[PDB]
């Protein structure tokens, strides 16, 4: 009689379909998903330092819009800008806004140090009804609106050395009056000019008089500029009118900081990978949640699923 001995392998009743080199559909005993397709719908407040902009853009927090006073001197790993954010101060633009936003975002700090600029012969601290702070006319906290004093605006020629061991970022501007008459009321002479320079750079701006559409009842505008001053260099401001002056400088750091546009709520939770949709788990190598990410994140791909076989071919009875 004797015996029979058969060699074999397992199988399961509930197999899973995967792709190989030759078959786009072959059944195996088990598989695992490699594409993360969901978020938890909130941005976890740990372990990265999150700064929720609330009603403030980063640039409004920089300049010191009155609704943004709570942000002074704060740092972040990730600044979160909300779609509801709005400006509520003197109307302005920033030529190359995207670059100033980017460099501040990457610096990761709003640390500001006041400096005593010698503004002799002019009126300081100009304010407007377009920028209300504690029910009073006010202005951007970090900027100093200079105007005529005793119907004179004597030329400004002011120096600020950088004797620190770090770079200084200066934010300043030019006021564009609505009319030739308002030019005179504010600055005494018919035409202003600004020159801001260092040993390694120069920026010359002329105001452009004219009507713009009213914003908070203001048809004039301010244009914002910036200047970096290295250790051992000097800022020189030379102007005969229309200068919106700096009050000091921002520290500029380098590191891992950034900015993200998102309306996701901030949660009390811990997750390494942030997307605008919310934090995502980072166990999988790929994800199709969002191409915008911050932190230790799976790589964005177009596929909504990629199944890795974790068992043999399934061959049911």
């Amino acid at each position: 009689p004797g015996a029979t001995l058969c060699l074999g392998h397992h199988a399961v009743p509930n197999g899973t379909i995967v792709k190989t080199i030759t078959n786009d559909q072959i059944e195996v005993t088990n598989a695992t998903e490699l594409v993360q397709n969901s978020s938890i719908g909130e941005i976890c407040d740990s372990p990265h330092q999150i700064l929720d902009g609330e009603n403030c853009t980063l640039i409004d927090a920089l300049l010191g819009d009155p609704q943004c006073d709570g942000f002074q001197n704060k740092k972040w790993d990730l600044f979160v800008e909300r779609s509801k954010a709005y400006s509520n101060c003197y109307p302005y633009d920033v030529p190359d806004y995207a670059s100033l936003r980017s460099l501040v975002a990457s610096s990761g700090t709003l640390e500001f140090n006041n400096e005593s600029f010698n503004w002799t012969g002019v009126t300081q601290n100009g304010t407007s009804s377009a920028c209300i702070r504690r029910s009073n006319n006010s202005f951007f906290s970090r900027l100093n609106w200079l105007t005529q004093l005793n119907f004179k605006y004597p030329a400004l020629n002011v120096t600020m050395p950088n004797n620190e061991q770090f770079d200084k970022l200066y934010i300043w501007g030019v006021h564009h009056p609505v009319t030739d008459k308002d030019q005179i009321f504010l600055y005494a002479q018919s035409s202003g000019r600004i020159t801001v320079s260092t040993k390694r750079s120069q920026q010359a701006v002329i105001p452009n008089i004219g009507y713009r559409p009213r914003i908070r009842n203001i048809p004039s505008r301010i244009s914002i500029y910036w200047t970096i001053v290295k250790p051992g260099d000097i800022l020189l401001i030379n102007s005969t009118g229309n200068l919106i002056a700096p009050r000091g400088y921002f520290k500029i750091r380098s590191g891992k900081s950034s900015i993200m546009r998102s309306d996701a709520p901030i949660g009390k939770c811990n997750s390494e990978c942030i997307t605008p949709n919310g934090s995502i788990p980072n166990d999988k190598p790929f994800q199709n949640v969002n191409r915008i990410t911050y932190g230790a994140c799976p790589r964005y791909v177009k596929q909504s699923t990629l199944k890795l076989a974790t068992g043999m071919r399934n061959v049911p009875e």
């Binding site: 001995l5 911050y294 932190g295 049911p316």
Partner: protein
């Protein structure tokens, strides 16, 4: 599969083997039974776990990058930002697709290979005492009780003990 055992000369798998991936079924004088082979099972599992270890929990940190959504029309610079990102995503998408296809072909072939290796090992161990029936089974030409079957599974089967009996049974008329 490229070795021809799983979905090949082994007609199908065994849904009732739940304590291993590969094993043995026998019929003899004392009944019929099943036992998992732990070494072959572990060899396949270790290889698969090695793949998983390369792919799971291994993400890369990125911080400040470029913008990828835009509220206004701008032309040349934005066209370039968009093209850089679309280019990147298509290359990573390709990489992911190829990786999974190669990995899965390889997992199927390696598990096929482990089945074949266990079959070949058993074949050699049996020497002139059995014949390959072509379907993953051996006809053993001698009385082979539960202890004897166990000895084959454990690698302690001495073919010389049974050879005279087996040769007489194989080469009769």
């Amino acid at each position: 599969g490229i070795f021809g055992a799983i979905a090949g000369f082994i007609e199908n798998g065994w849904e009732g083997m739940v304590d291993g991936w590969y094993g043995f079924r026998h019929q003899n004088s004392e009944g019929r039974g099943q036992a998992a082979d732990l070494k072959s099972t572990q060899a396949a599992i270790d290889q698969i776990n090695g793949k998983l270890n390369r792919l799971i929990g291994k993400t890369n940190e990125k911080f400040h990058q470029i913008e990828k959504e835009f509220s206004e029309v701008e032309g040349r610079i934005q066209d370039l930002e968009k093209y850089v990102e679309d280019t990147k995503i298509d290359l990573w998408s390709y990489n992911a697709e190829l990786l999974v296809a190669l990995e899965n072909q390889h997992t199927i072939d390696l598990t096929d290979s482990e089945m074949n290796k266990l079959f070949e090992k058993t074949k050699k161990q049996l020497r002139e005492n059995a014949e390959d029936m072509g379907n993953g089974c051996f006809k053993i030409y001698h009385k082979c009780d539960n202890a004897c079957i166990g000895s084959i599974r454990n690698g302690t089967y001495d073919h010389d003990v049974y050879r005279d009996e087996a040769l007489n049974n194989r080469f009769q008329i």
